[PDB]
Amino acid sequence: SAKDYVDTIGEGTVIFKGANLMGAGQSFKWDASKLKFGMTLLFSRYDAANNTPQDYYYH
Amino acid sequence: LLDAEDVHAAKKSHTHEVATYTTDGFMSSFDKQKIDQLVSPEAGVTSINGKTG
Amino acid sequence: LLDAEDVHAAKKSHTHEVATYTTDGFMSSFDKQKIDQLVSPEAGVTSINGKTG
Amino acid sequence: AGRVLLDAEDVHAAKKSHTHEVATYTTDGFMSSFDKQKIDQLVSPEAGV
Ligand SMILES: [Fe+3]
Numbered sequence: 001s002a003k004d005y006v007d008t009i010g011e012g013t014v015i016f017k018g019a020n021l022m023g024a025g026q027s028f029k030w031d032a033s034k035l036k037f038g039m040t041l042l043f044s045r046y047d048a049a050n051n052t053p054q055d056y057y058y059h
Numbered sequence: 060l061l062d063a064e065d066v067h068a069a070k071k072s073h074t075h076e077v078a079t080y081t082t083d084g085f086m087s088s089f090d091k092q093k094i095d096q097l098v099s100p101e102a103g104v105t106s107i108n109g110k111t112g
Numbered sequence: 113l114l115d116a117e118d119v120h121a122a123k124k125s126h127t128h129e130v131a132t133y134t135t136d137g138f139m140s141s142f143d144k145q146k147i148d149q150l151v152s153p154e155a156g157v158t159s160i161n162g163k164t165g
Numbered sequence: 166a167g168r169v170l171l172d173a174e175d176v177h178a179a180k181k182s183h184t185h186e187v188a189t190y191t192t193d194g195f196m197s198s199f200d201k202q203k204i205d206q207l208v209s210p211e212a213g214v
Pocket of ligand 1: 075
């Protein structure tokens with residue numbers, strides 16, 4: 001059970017998967033107890049005219 | 060031989076339909092695509108000449 | 113005679129509690145009405161001859 | 166035969182304490198906790214004129 005607990009903390013739970021500019025107004029909330037280590041953010045290249053989330057040049 | 064129907068139980072894999080204006084349930088894939096990018100500001104006109112509605 | 117309870121199985125017509133701050137599940141129907149109001153609100157007049165507030 | 170123990174497995178039925186996967190962009194399923202945590206704080210549109 002301890003091994004499962006630490007492994008489940010390590011693999012993490014996805015908060016948002018998809019794509020958005022993350023501009024003014026958008027936000028995300030969660031229970032504080034779900035946070036044990038921290039948060040991770042992944043960004044990618046985007047198209048303003050086409051509005052399709054290209055998949056490369058991640059950060 | 061017994062399966063879920065004979066014992067009057069739900070299947071191992073099953074769906075509960077979407078949640079409507081008066082019924083609970085899941086959310087349509089469109090709903091999930093809507094909520095994540097849904098934004099707070101809705102603006103509008105709050106009052107004109109001291110009258111609302 | 114066997115039933116869903118007799119075999120520790122979910123009832124053929126069973127429902128889950130609505131999701132909370134920590135556990136997932138269904139959403140309340142008026143929550144569905146709320147989110148459907150947030151998307152495409154058409155709530156009143158947004159601007160009257162280019163004027164707001 | 167003999168003393169037989171029957172649960173939801175041998176009848177291929179869902180457990181009483183069972184949960185479905187959260188809905189995705191192309192999948193239908195439970196509404197996530199943080200989805201509701203985002204929804205409730207989202208103020209309802211203001212009805213003026
Ligand atoms: Fe179920």
